[PDB]
Design an enzyme around this catalytic site. Structure first.
Site, mmCIF file in Angstrom:
data_model
loop_
_atom_site.group_PDB
_atom_site.id
_atom_site.type_symbol
_atom_site.label_atom_id
_atom_site.label_comp_id
_atom_site.label_asym_id
_atom_site.label_seq_id
_atom_site.Cartn_x
_atom_site.Cartn_y
_atom_site.Cartn_z
ATOM 1 C CG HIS A 1 12.908 2.387 -5.639
ATOM 2 N ND1 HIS A 1 13.410 1.337 -4.900
ATOM 3 C CD2 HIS A 1 11.653 2.611 -5.179
ATOM 4 C CE1 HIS A 1 12.510 0.969 -4.006
ATOM 5 N NE2 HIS A 1 11.430 1.707 -4.169
ATOM 6 C CG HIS B 1 8.690 2.596 -9.216
ATOM 7 N ND1 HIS B 1 7.569 1.877 -8.862
ATOM 8 C CD2 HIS B 1 8.901 3.488 -8.209
ATOM 9 C CE1 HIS B 1 7.113 2.319 -7.704
ATOM 10 N NE2 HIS B 1 7.911 3.284 -7.278
ATOM 11 C CG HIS C 1 6.969 8.556 -6.347
ATOM 12 N ND1 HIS C 1 6.848 8.088 -7.636
ATOM 13 C CD2 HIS C 1 7.135 7.467 -5.563
ATOM 14 C CE1 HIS C 1 6.958 6.770 -7.634
ATOM 15 N NE2 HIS C 1 7.115 6.367 -6.389
ATOM 16 C CG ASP C 2 10.409 6.281 -5.627
ATOM 17 O OD1 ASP C 2 10.488 6.674 -4.431
ATOM 18 O OD2 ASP C 2 9.751 5.259 -5.970
ATOM 19 C CG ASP D 1 5.105 4.262 -4.303
ATOM 20 O OD1 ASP D 1 5.814 3.895 -5.256
ATOM 21 O OD2 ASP D 1 5.577 4.890 -3.333
ATOM 22 C CG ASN E 1 4.784 -3.065 -8.447
ATOM 23 O OD1 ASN E 1 5.953 -3.069 -8.070
ATOM 24 N ND2 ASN E 1 4.281 -2.098 -9.196
ATOM 25 C CD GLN F 1 6.265 -9.831 -3.609
ATOM 26 O OE1 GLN F 1 5.293 -9.106 -3.827
ATOM 27 N NE2 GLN F 1 7.425 -9.356 -3.158
ATOM 28 C CG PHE G 1 4.456 -6.462 0.244
ATOM 29 C CD1 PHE G 1 4.549 -5.472 1.202
ATOM 30 C CD2 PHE G 1 4.432 -6.095 -1.096
ATOM 31 C CE1 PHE G 1 4.609 -4.130 0.839
ATOM 32 C CE2 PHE G 1 4.489 -4.762 -1.463
ATOM 33 C CZ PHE G 1 4.578 -3.778 -0.497
HETATM 34 O O1 LIG Z 1 9.243 1.818 -0.026
HETATM 35 C C1 LIG Z 1 9.220 1.198 -1.109
HETATM 36 O O2 LIG Z 1 9.417 1.719 -2.226
HETATM 37 C C2 LIG Z 1 8.958 -0.276 -1.059
HETATM 38 C C3 LIG Z 1 8.982 -1.044 -2.231
HETATM 39 C C4 LIG Z 1 8.748 -2.386 -2.191
HETATM 40 C C5 LIG Z 1 8.469 -3.042 -0.976
HETATM 41 C C6 LIG Z 1 8.438 -2.266 0.200
HETATM 42 C C7 LIG Z 1 8.683 -0.878 0.139
HETATM 43 N N1 LIG Z 1 8.175 -2.813 1.430
HETATM 44 C C8 LIG Z 1 7.952 -4.089 1.564
HETATM 45 N N2 LIG Z 1 7.680 -4.563 2.833
HETATM 46 C C9 LIG Z 1 7.398 -3.886 4.041
HETATM 47 C C10 LIG Z 1 7.682 -2.539 4.227
HETATM 48 C C11 LIG Z 1 7.388 -1.921 5.428
HETATM 49 C C12 LIG Z 1 6.816 -2.625 6.462
HETATM 50 C C13 LIG Z 1 6.538 -3.959 6.276
HETATM 51 CL CL1 LIG Z 1 5.817 -4.865 7.574
HETATM 52 C C14 LIG Z 1 6.823 -4.610 5.089
HETATM 53 C C15 LIG Z 1 7.954 -4.981 0.430
HETATM 54 C C16 LIG Z 1 7.710 -6.363 0.542
HETATM 55 C C17 LIG Z 1 7.739 -7.123 -0.584
HETATM 56 N N3 LIG Z 1 7.990 -6.635 -1.837
HETATM 57 C C18 LIG Z 1 8.223 -5.334 -1.967
HETATM 58 C C19 LIG Z 1 8.215 -4.455 -0.855
HETATM 59 MG MG LIG Z 2 9.761 6.181 -2.697
HETATM 60 ZN ZN LIG Z 3 7.872 4.460 -5.487
#
Ligand SMILES: O=C(O)c1ccc2c(c1)nc(Nc1cccc(Cl)c1)c1ccncc12
Ligand SMILES: [Mg+2]
Ligand SMILES: [Zn+2]
Ligand SMILES: O=C(O)c1ccc2c(c1)nc(Nc1cccc(Cl)c1)c1ccncc12
Ligand SMILES: [Mg+2]
Ligand SMILES: [Zn+2]
EC number: 3.1.4.53
Lengths: 324, 324
Positions: free
Chosen positions: B73, B77, B113-114, B231, B234, B282, B285
């Site tokens: 972040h 990004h 935003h971040d 956002d 990626n 991944q 996700f």
């Molecule tokens: O907020 C960010 O910047 C942000 C940034 C990256 C990820 C994220 C949130 N949330 C993830 N997972 C996630 C988040 C919320 C709920 C559920 Cl079930 C899963 C996730 C998974 C894998 N790689 C990157 C991320």
């Molecule tokens: Mg953010």
């Molecule tokens: Zn962000």
């Protein structure tokens, strides 16, 4: 003076407590002595192992962070809303409905709900590009601030009245207090009232005659509306109290309007001391906001609130009579 | 250096820009050079009369308040989300659906935003009783802070890039920027997606091509989901980009989990370096968050998102193939 103050505090369970007199008799500590009395009445010190010196220290610090030079949104208003919430919590239709932690949350939320109020509105803070509006992105600006100050003060020396709650109790109380104080933003009034109406229309009552609230959403909605009613309870009080509250909010409104005029802004409604009608403004406030809310609350707890509603209707008739 | 910088800038209109190269070739100022290039491509300095030197002064000021020791972040990004939003705004099914001000709001929101992100999640800030969570009452803690910093920096010397907007334009832009950045809170993802889905089932389109959004509610919701998509873009990027982003977010997550471990806290999902499956995480996700979002988006602008959706499905294919 100690004797008379104790005599007055014996009315803590009554609608119409002489809160301005208690303010005088307590040495401008209405919030401290009323909160302390209510905490003893409800046995909250024993239940939550609150050291009495910690409670007094926090309460005096919280009371200090209300502005003594703001006519309406001050420690007397905070004490009033606390005491009014305390009475509403005791209503028969809600007996044993809320836990000790929910009772604590509702009373604590009332105590902190306007702390550090500067005496101007959210819209004024937004329109003047205030630091507060910048911090809070124009969204429930004051109410977010009241919460932040109220919780931050718990971190001062010997001020953590929740030191002996469990971690889950603290987490649950914090969430409930936040949900309640954010609901005091008047911009949410119509939505809050619409939900209260829906609850009345679908009301359920247990075999013991009290309100059935079996999920967090309904429980917190009732507490939000309860503190909102307490916040909007001045027109339901005996007229000598109501008129003093009206004098005070008009002084606050006029001072805001004087700042809006000095800055070349449009003057907010009821804020122009040169084209004001205090009496018509009270009748309209009752007709469009306060009576709709209180008539709905009275329906929720029928017949518990009949005397309060009767006083409101009498006060509306009185203010109306001063118009012709 | 500056001419190889220029040839890669040439594809700011393309999904898959070489942002890490651009970050290196720019002396760690990708946010500044990408924002500047985008404002020229969309003619925003002319339409909104923004002094070019004030654009640069604020952009470098904003970029500076991103943390250089935060692996994901950070300012790279922020530049990537800007560029991805800029591309999504040229979706054929959305040709000028949004006015010049709405385009500006979406791009400015992407840039801030971040900002000032500490490298830990909202839940970490809440559960550690952080000052930020105390200020913002546990609600969209980071996103409120990103907004407050992003707007406060405008008040630095020669940073008010909106100085020549009309007062109504400045108020409208502020409201839209807030609405967009608050929607980047991942806790709101499901609500944002359900509304994108409802819009899909109520989609009204021309025969000429374009989506038809009439009310502000539907409009801001598309831009909220748009910047949300950027956002979360990626896994839809060329694989060597996606793999670099994954290395960075896993480093940031592992550092947060090291703090949850050393404090005795429950380790957040994917944050335990001793118990991690980067590749499974991944694929999960993508399966549960990124693909349902991007396929719902793909339907709303059918079929202009087909290649982005294909690349996402390919990358899910590849990450899955790395699991033995
Ligand atoms: O907020 C960010 O910047 C942000 C940034 C990256 C990820 C994220 C949130 N949330 C993830 N997972 C996630 C988040 C919320 C709920 C559920 Cl079930 C899963 C996730 C998974 C894998 N790689 C990157 C991320
Ligand atoms: Mg953010
Ligand atoms: Zn962000
Ligand atoms: O927020 C407070 O503390 C607060 C405190 C007092 C009043 C108020 C809000 N809002 C009033 N009026 C109002 C507010 C919103 C909509 C409409 Cl139709 C009317 C009002 C009127 C008369 N006297 C006191 C008040
Ligand atoms: Mg208030
Ligand atoms: Zn109040």
């Amino acid at each position: 003076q100690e004797d008379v103050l104790a005599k007055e505090l014996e009315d803590v369970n009554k609608w119409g407590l002489h809160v301005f007199r208690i303010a005088e008799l307590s040495g401008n500590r209405p919030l401290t002595v009323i909160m302390h009395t209510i905490f003893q009445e409800r046995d909250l010190l024993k239940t939550f192992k609150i050291p009495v010196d910690t409670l007094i220290t926090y309460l005096m610090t919280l009371e200090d962070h209300y502005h003594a030079d703001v006519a309406y949104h001050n420690n007397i208003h905070a004490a009033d809303v606390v005491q009014s919430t305390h009475v509403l919590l005791s209503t028969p239709a809600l007996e044993a409905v809320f836990t000790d932690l929910e009772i604590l949350a509702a009373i604590f939320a009332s105590a902190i709900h306007d702390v550090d109020h500067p005496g101007v509105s959210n819209q004024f803070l937004i329109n003047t590009n205030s630091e507060l509006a910048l911090m809070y992105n124009d969204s429930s600006v004051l109410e977010n601030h009241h919460l932040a100050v109220g919780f931050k003060l718990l971190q001062e020396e010997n001020c953590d009245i929740f030191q002996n709650l469990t971690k889950k109790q603290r987490q649950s109380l914090r969430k409930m207090v936040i949900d309640i104080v954010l609901a005091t933003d008047m911009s949410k009034h119509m939505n809050l009232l619409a939900d209260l109406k829906t609850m009345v229309e679908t009301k359920k009552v247990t075999s013991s005659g009290v309100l059935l609230l079996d999920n967090y959403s309904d429980r917190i909605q009732v507490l939000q509306n309860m503190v909102h009613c307490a916040d909007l309870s001045n027109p339901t009080k005996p007229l000598q109290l109501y008129r003093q509250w009206t004098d005070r909010i008009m002084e606050e409104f006029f001072r805001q309007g004087d700042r809006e005029r000095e800055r070349g802004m449009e003057i907010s409604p009821m804020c122009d001391k040169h084209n004001a009608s205090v009496e018509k403004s009270q009748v309209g406030f009752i007709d469009y906001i306060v009576h709709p809310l209180w008539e709905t609350w009275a329906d929720l707890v029928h017949p518990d609130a009949q005397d309060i509603l009767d006083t409101l209707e009498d006060n509306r008739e009185w203010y109306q009579s001063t118009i012709p």
